[PDB]
Amino acid sequence: PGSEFGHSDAQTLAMMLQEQLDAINKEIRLIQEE
């Protein structure tokens, strides 16, 4: 299912989105090193 965020403000959401994007870039980097 889709994620449930309730009444999270844009600030909190932006942080979690950025964390998600950072995690993607980190995983890709780890893949390209092995």
């Binding site: 403000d9 959401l13 979690m16 950025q18 995690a23 870039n25 995983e27």
Partner: protein, 123 residues
């Protein structure tokens, strides 16, 4: 058609994340007029990434992640249409809008990450 190469998945994923990154920038810089073109570039990037996988994937996690990816891109497209009301300048709750838009992008990135992981583990 089977599972795509890790290199191909990374390429399409990076196009998705780049476009999502630009959307987040628009939200933070209050470029609310840019929400529709950003969502279209994202939706396109999502379509190209999805096309890397079989029309009917064998793997259950691919089916699940593609469902999340596609549904979230569509949901995003639905949300961004509020930045272009038929009467220019009409009342819009930009706080609620931005919240919904970032939620969609979060799940798109989430699904994209899952697909990257799935592809790598099968190689």
């Amino acid at each position: 058609p089977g599972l795509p190469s890790t290199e191909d998945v990374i390429l399409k994923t990076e196009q998705v994340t780049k476009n999502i990154q630009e959307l987040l920038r628009a939200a933070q810089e209050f470029k609310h007029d840019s929400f529709v073109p950003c969502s279209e570039k994202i939706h396109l990037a999502v379509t190209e990434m999805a096309s890397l996988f079989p029309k009917r994937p064998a793997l259950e996690p691919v089916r699940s992640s593609l469902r999340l990816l596609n549904a979230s891109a569509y949901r995003l497209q639905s949300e961004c249409r509020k930045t272009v009301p038929p009467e220019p300048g009409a009342p819009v709750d930009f706080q609620l809008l931005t919240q919904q838009v970032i939620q969609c992008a979060y799940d798109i990135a989430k699904a994209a990450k899952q697909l990257v992981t799935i592809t790598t583990r099968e190689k």
